[PDB]
Amino acid sequence: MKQYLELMQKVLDEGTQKNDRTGTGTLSIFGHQMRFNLQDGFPLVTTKRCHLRSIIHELLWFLQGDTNIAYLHENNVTIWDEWADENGDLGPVYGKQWRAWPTPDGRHIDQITTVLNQLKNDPDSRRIIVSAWNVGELDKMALAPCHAFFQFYVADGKLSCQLYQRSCDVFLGLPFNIASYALLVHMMAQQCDLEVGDFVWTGGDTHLYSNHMDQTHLQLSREPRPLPKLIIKRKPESIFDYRFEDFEIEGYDPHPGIKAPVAI
Amino acid sequence: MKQYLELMQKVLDEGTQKNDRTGTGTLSIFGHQMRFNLQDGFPLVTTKRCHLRSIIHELLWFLQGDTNIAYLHENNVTIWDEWADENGDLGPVYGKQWRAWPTPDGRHIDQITTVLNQLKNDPDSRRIIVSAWNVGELDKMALAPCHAFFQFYVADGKLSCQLYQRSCDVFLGLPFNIASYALLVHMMAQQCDLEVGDFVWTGGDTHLYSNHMDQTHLQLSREPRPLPKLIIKRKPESIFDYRFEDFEIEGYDPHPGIKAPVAI
Numbered sequence A, B: 001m002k003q004y005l006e007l008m009q010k011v012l013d014e015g016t017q018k019n020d021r022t023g024t025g026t027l028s029i030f031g032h033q034m035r036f037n038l039q040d041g042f043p044l045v046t047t048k049r050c051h052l053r054s055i056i057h058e059l060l061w062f063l064q065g066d067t068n069i070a071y072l073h074e075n076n077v078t079i080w081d082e083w084a085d086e087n088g089d090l091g092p093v094y095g096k097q098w099r100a101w102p103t104p105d106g107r108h109i110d111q112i113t114t115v116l117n118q119l120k121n122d123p124d125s126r127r128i129i130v131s132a133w134n135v136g137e138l139d140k141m142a143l144a145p146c147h148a149f150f151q152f153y154v155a156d157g158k159l160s161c162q163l164y165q166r167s168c169d170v171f172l173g174l175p176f177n178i179a180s181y182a183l184l185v186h187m188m189a190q191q192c193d194l195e196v197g198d199f200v201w202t203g204g205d206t207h208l209y210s211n212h213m214d215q216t217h218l219q220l221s222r223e224p225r226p227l228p229k230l231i232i233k234r235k236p237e238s239i240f241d242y243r244f245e246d247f248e249i250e251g252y253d254p255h256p257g258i259k260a261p262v263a264i
């Protein structure tokens, strides 16, 4: 996508060398923002084939408040293998915080349910937020939340969402992340009888891994193509009742997928 | 400042009318980002005289982990009066979350000390973050955190910081918020023997209150003047030992102040 490719190029031109916790090394910039009007098309990168099967199952997995990769494996999703433990646990990551953020007093808060009720009863609210950045549980997570905090907004009957990604693997993670949240917006909008607005992506430490340079140059040599159209074939009774079969992408004809090693 | 005036103009040009919690009504946009290179000068709005006295005291107050307005009153700062209870309490807002975020197992995390340790031992870390958005205590607070989440970054010996402000009163609050974090960056940089980088401001629901329009246009009719200069006269033993007198702003020649009503 135009904005994705411009970011990729910006990291190459302006990024500075960094030595991350892994020791792989990266080129990094700090602070960037992109906007995707969801009515212009589903923001699924076309300069490389991105498989939605993994994106969709991970999101449904998050919404169920599950943090054990069992469900993912049952659908052959391996994106979370490199961080799960012997029992397939990741600790109180995304799913847990989204559906059951533990309060100091031993109880839990369901942020997704809160958000749905806010969108339906108080759409003008400036507090429609979901945060996975539970400071008190970071030490228990297999890894700290990358897509850390997001906010919804309603105007002119349209639902928008802004994501703050504190750390972003531009080549491997970003395409996945953008599609995941764009999808969530479509789902929320459907449950709230709203049209889709913009997905605003904001990044903190936005980087390209040193061992992703060849792939980056390859992708930058490719021209983006018209974005596909997301079709939801069934309207479930709640945001928690979606299933893989409900989603279908139309008119998606991307350049060939590009293989690249992930940093552990 | 150029960036600030351009944001005001952006809200005016692309904003949508919206009702709000205070029942005042606003003109708002969703998603914005701007940067202030702190080496260019201290980002204190010059198109209207801004009260640095209250800004400094509010920040020292946050850093002490205080959430009662008594300290502010002792120093003639009234910006938090409208929301404090009869005892002067605001609940576990900014200060409390910054210095003692309560975990579910009875511990408390001092995020400010944590960030300082990360800057010292692992400046390339991609998780040098402070969050005031404690989901479990939001409804104990007089108001939900506006400047809700911020991240630090270090490159070429310069300290940068990005703030995600989920709700922004552009006319009254923003000038304060920008100077506040710029001040914090200078303080942290001094404690860490780093030079200042950029302060990146990102907004969610960024609005102008309906009853701030004439004041906003009056301010927009003015040309920004040279940015003032911030001089820190001492290096305290810790980030928690600064005093009002340690700060001096030089060359601040603002246009006349413009009064406006705060939305409660």
Ligand SMILES: Nc1nc2c(c(=O)[nH]1)N[C@@H](CNc1ccc(C(=O)N[C@@H](CCC(=O)O)C(=O)O)cc1)CN2
Binding pocket: A050, A051, A054, A078, A079, A080, A143, A146, A169, A172, A173, A174, A176, A257, A258, A259, A260, A262, A263, A264
């Ligand atoms: N460092 C790194 N670590 C991560 C993530 C990341 O973002 N980068 N994100 C989380 C895991 N998510 C992913 C998402 C995509 C991939 C990935 O490897 N994608 C390949 C393979 C896709 C497939 O499996 O079919 C691609 O070509 O798109 C790896 C981890 C947690 N850890």
Ligand SMILES: Nc1nc2c(c(=O)[nH]1)N[C@@H](CNc1ccc(C(=O)N[C@@H](CCC(=O)O)C(=O)O)cc1)CN2
Binding pocket: B050, B051, B054, B078, B079, B080, B143, B146, B169, B172, B173, B174, B176, B258, B259, B260, B262, B263, B264
């Ligand atoms: N709606 C609104 N409510 C708020 C804030 C905001 O951002 N706007 N921010 C917090 C309170 N902070 C402020 C900051 C400035 C002012 C204010 O009133 N400033 C005047 C007066 C300053 C003074 O006392 O000298 C000015 O001219 O700058 C009001 C609330 C919480 N509630």
Ligand SMILES: *c1cc(=O)[nH]c(=O)n1[C@H]1C[C@H](O)[C@@H](COP(=O)(O)O)O1
Binding pocket: A020, A021, A143, A144, A145, A146, A147, A167, A168, A169, A170, A172, A173, A174, A177, A263, B126, B127
């Ligand atoms: C984290 C997970 C995701 O969904 N998207 C991402 O881009 N990533 C990347 C960012 C970084 O390369 C790595 C996490 O490392 P750290 O926690 O920032 O040290 O995964």
Ligand SMILES: *c1cc(=O)[nH]c(=O)n1[C@H]1C[C@H](O)[C@@H](COP(=O)(O)O)O1
Binding pocket: A126, A127, B021, B022, B143, B144, B145, B146, B147, B167, B168, B169, B170, B173, B174, B177, B263
């Ligand atoms: C909150 C505190 C601050 O330091 N800066 C701000 O801009 N404000 C503003 C945002 C909004 O106008 C109001 C809070 O109201 P709500 O919680 O967003 O409904 O104060």
